[PDB]
Symmetry: C5
Subunit: 238 residues, 5 copies
């Protein structure tokens, strides 16, 4: 069947870490203070890039034990993601930010269904209270094989999906990234909302759309609260 076609924007890194609190507590106070200052100077550089419209980023603390902090970073090139990851890992604070999970993808718009397009391809991440991230595949199993469907069938299934999503306009903003050939699943799904319950409302409602019911295969789900840089010192205080 006819392959879908995409427009592609910025590369995206989701970098999840666990905080080594017991080790952090043993670090002398002035060294913790210097590590927090060093980290915030790094983020200052990211903010400069964002203000110049050459990238975007967001920082969230993650609920539960799967992760404690998320750095979501969008850049025009894969090399810039490698350099930002490397610079972060060389900070003192990163010695206490243990690997938890990561995702490499690229902002994607598809063929199924201008300044407005560019705002989506090169998104400034919203400053919402909450974030949700999970990866997904579309199933290739028996009669539930998305990639064997005709283009017309896939278009109609996506139309129904979009109708459900439009009900959550003004409540949730989604950034879909494509990762076929780049990471372990086929898409990254990032949701932003000021009400975390809307993540549950939207995703559960969509599970009854036929495209999700028959073809969705989901990875792990991460939910978090925004970490304003002015709260970093407080958050890491011990």
């Amino acid at each position: 069947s006819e392959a879908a076609q995409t427009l592609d924007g910025w590369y995206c890194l989701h970098d999840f870490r666990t905080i080594d609190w017991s080790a952090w507590k043993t670090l002398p106070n002035e060294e913790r203070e210097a590590a927090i200052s060093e980290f915030l100077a790094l983020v200052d550089q990211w903010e400069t890039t964002e203000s110049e419209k050459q990238g975007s980023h967001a920082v969230y603390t993650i609920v539960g034990q799967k992760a404690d902090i998320l750095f979501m970073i969008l850049r025009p090139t894969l090399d810039e993601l490698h350099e930002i990851e490397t610079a972060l890992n060389k900070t003192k604070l990163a010695d206490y930010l243990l690997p938890a999970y990561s995702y490499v993808s690229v902002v994607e718009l598809s063929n199924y269904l201008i300044p407005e397009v560019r705002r989506r391809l090169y998104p400034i991440l919203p400053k919402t209270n909450y974030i949700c991230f999970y990866p997904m595949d579309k199933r290739r199993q028996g009669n539930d094989n998305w990639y064997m469907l005709s283009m017309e069938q896939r278009r109609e299934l996506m139309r129904a999906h979009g109708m459900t999503g439009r009900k959550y306009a003004g409540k949730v903003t989604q950034i879909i990234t494509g990762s076929v050939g780049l990471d372990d699943f086929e898409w990254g799904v990032t949701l932003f909302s000021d009400d975390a319950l809307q993540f549950k409302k939207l995703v559960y409602e969509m599970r009854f759309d036929e495209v999700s019911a028959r073809f969705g295969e989901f990875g792990s789900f991460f939910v978090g609260t925004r970490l304003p840089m002015e709260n970093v010192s407080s958050f890491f205080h011990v």
Copy 2:
């Protein structure tokens, strides 16, 4: 098919830890005593929140190696759960409470006119005070989406028929087991959390096994790991951590 609609209550955290006994034994006695005091002061704050009907909590020791202790916490906001876990992780005792497993969810009632949020029994279930039973059981689950066993493709009517049989089986365990179902689609790795409370641990086995012969569980149930534990009264904490 028609999407299920939900009533949603308090946010829920299941926080499971393993105890680092070998490291705890090397900590000087007075530092252990201070760590236990500090932990109990934290829980005292949770008890105040519960007495004010603004949350609930439960603490259980877990049998086997998957975990040693469970803190189950209900709060009106996700932020409050995050603040409680951060405060816990900043205690001295938490340095010896190694991560084992966790679960993030919301208390959920289904739709399987009056506003249900105003109904007394609904409010009692949406914002529950957790029972102080001898035993607890926790596991997560999904409903299957495979071939002709696809729960989410069934009509609303078909799903209601299947759930009526489930409820009939569950009502046989009235007065023996209380369930708290939380929803986690969009929040964690499975679709629901199932927490059972009972004064007789065998009832966990009796209920779940009997329910496995109801078609909804037999045909659509997909289960994660099962955690079973015994209640840890706060007055026993010092004794439990004594070395």
Copy 3:
């Protein structure tokens, strides 16, 4: 279909550990001797409980890297399993017994009250055999569109299980099985523990049973652990470095 009914006995803990030999070697000799004596005093308490018919236990060393030692403990309450686990972990030796795997279950058998029948009582509250070898694995019964054990009629399940029992009876006097149920208690639906003085019989039985329809069509298996009995009088020798 009609739900199966079960008879339930003692709670069961399978506690598997790996031995941290490299760390154990650095512990001074007299501290190792003290640790062994402390462990043996704990086991002496378990033996007292068994002699009073209020529980049972078995200790086996496990072949391969999945585990090195197994403590199998039966008690009348879940609380006692928690207390025994906690007491073991507070010993010095336990600092060198790293977690490997564990299983929590209840001894299970599938008008007169069966709980008053002598043979039922002997199986629900069993004294564990002191055989040369042990084998443990957990299992589920399949729930798939084509073959779903829990959707079968009671009569279909009974027929499948009669054939199973016919195959097992051929191994009478060669292998003793203790089946525990773990629905609602652990990650699989049953625990299977086999005891025999000839480890080959584990292979003979399980492989033959795999051609019974109940196992071929519905068996879903976890990991298999095989071990050799560790008499307490050999513990010091086993831990000698």
Copy 4:
């Protein structure tokens, strides 16, 4: 059905490592400098082997947390791979290159569809900006069993695959290695490109070919950026 037949070339090792930055930072500067010099002397031996047309290699930094660096090594014998692996692990730098993932395979050409053949069997790895690696199986499940299809059925499916691949001529170079009997999947797929987006475009378009849609079973995907040896010192600077 009729088994496929293969021509086989050099053995291939994909050796993925994570960098232990926190430990590297505690090593004295002159010892870090010596470690980098020792590593570069080892790579100099690899370059000599390649110039003599007795093997090939490539070094890439990997984005995300699955790995930080990839050494891809082609040699005529499995023993030579064992020896290179052992020599690398005996360097000081390797103490800070923690195991992440590895793959053992052999360059393979099939009979589905001379100097040119030898240039494919014994390839000089390209110096492209980016690399992508993942392993795969072909499905044996239900009605989708590749190995029970006839030879002619498989040839037709592969003809369509090749037609899609030729559209990416001059943009992506693939090196397919076979690993049945040698590692956990059936093939290794390595893609080289100066445009990382082409990995996504190619792999995603190929997922709509029937052979990939119905039979592809994929492992983890690793994507990286070339590490010139003249940049190693800078990359490891702390």
Copy 5:
């Protein structure tokens, strides 16, 4: 359907380890020399057992990161495997040989007094070949819907295996297989060990066999480990830092 019957020989341990190079480098030279000598003395005991025809062993270095070294050990009893494992873990070298993977099985010949035939005995109690290369992986046979190996008749399974044997005999003189059975003993149903002086033959054979119906329709495979022989006279050089 009719259960397969087996002739069974020596028990088999596959013990895979990763080498802790960074820690080994910090051990003083004379202690590394002592550790190597102690290890070689242990292997000398194994060689004595083999020369007396009471067991066999092989040592290979494994390519890639899944493992670095393989000890494959055959003994008449499970107890002896457990004792060899324990004696190895108590050597100094073993402190730098981290667990990677293990497999417990028993040499198996199927029926698809034999124990006195010399040729049967050479297969039940094999002297492991000293080939350049080794390959190991475990496998199951599928039990899924209407592709269920254990539901086939004895005659159906025999015919499928006849075709398998036809493909294998083409690799006579190039590859030697040792099949062990592990139902009831480890996590899969069989262990497959291949020996060859040409590692490519592992790929040629396994890939060609994947188009036989028994492998195509019923084969379920675990991880594959491939290695190069480690002569004892090379151990010192291999561990030299």
